[PDB]
Amino acid sequence: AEEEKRKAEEEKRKLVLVIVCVALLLDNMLYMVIVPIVPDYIVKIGVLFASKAILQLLVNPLSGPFIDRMSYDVPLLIGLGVMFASTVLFAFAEDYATLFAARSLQGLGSAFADTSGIAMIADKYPEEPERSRALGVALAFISFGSLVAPPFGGILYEFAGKRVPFLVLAAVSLFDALLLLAVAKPPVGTPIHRLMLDPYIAVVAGALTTCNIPLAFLEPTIATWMKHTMAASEWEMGMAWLPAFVPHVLGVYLTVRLAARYPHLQWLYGALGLAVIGASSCIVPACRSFAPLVVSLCGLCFGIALVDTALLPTLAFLVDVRHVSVYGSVYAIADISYSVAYALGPIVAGHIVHSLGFEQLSLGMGLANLLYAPVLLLLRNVGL
């Protein structure tokens, strides 16, 4: 029964991959579906979104050690449990402060669930040409839940309210957590004090910060830019993030296939992604109809797809080779990067586009990414 054992090992491993990708879908669906529905229930709302992400910046440098002290199935149980808590706290509560605590809770739940989920995808796929494939499918479900879910959330919020959508989504969350319990049934690490002084973790964390900063700044800012420049409406600005899903995954496929064909200069096909985000940093403020802004955001999701799918596998490869082979603290560093982007986002984005303008924010993205894109030369001989 050895070959039955190996096949069933592959079945449990693929089931854990699919279940963790669907948990990532549920979490990102929660995030990008509750972004529009909050201002029905009053400055102090940008601080709600950034308090989610800044709470996440609070808990994941602490959660990173608390993830590496334990097999990762239990800190994904914790993550989907507080996902269920936050989601029913959306569905039954309507006050701004319970909404605030639910969004914040979700911040800690993103820390636990997303960090341990990407971490056990990196564990359970130790071989590199299938690690990059599994992290690419993780990115695929994250982009699905972050891009095609605001259309489903719009069509089930201004046609079904918020009680029954978030209770059926809480049902899928609890069922995915209990299915993870049905399929998984659950040494010392590198300190963050020793990861933050490493140059290679620091340049990849700056890469994740800088590639997440346009999706940080634009998402509460694209709406008022539609209103000011393009004169948009309900049906227009809400599904202008949908058509950027299909390039994203396709871009993922490139930096999955090229992970196996030419794995030499992967940092090239990391930094190239950042460079085309710089193309986004040129092409966003000159869009004359719906199609140029759609293809600009397609390029934006395309570039961050390339950057995440080419820099999450080499992040686990970096903590494999240079450090001890645990994956909780290093994707806690990745999620600190994601979190500091989405925490600097909604506080300052709207007020600088009120004050300075929007071309100043696009040229700020240009200055940041074009002062950062040759810093990926620091990974020059790592791929050996």
Ligand SMILES: O[C@H]1CCCC[C@@H]1N1CCC(c2ccccc2)CC1
């Ligand atoms: O930095 C990455 C690693 C940490 C966890 C998830 C992060 N990443 C964030 C943006 C997300 C995204 C956003 C918009 C469209 C498509 C996809 C892709 C995943």
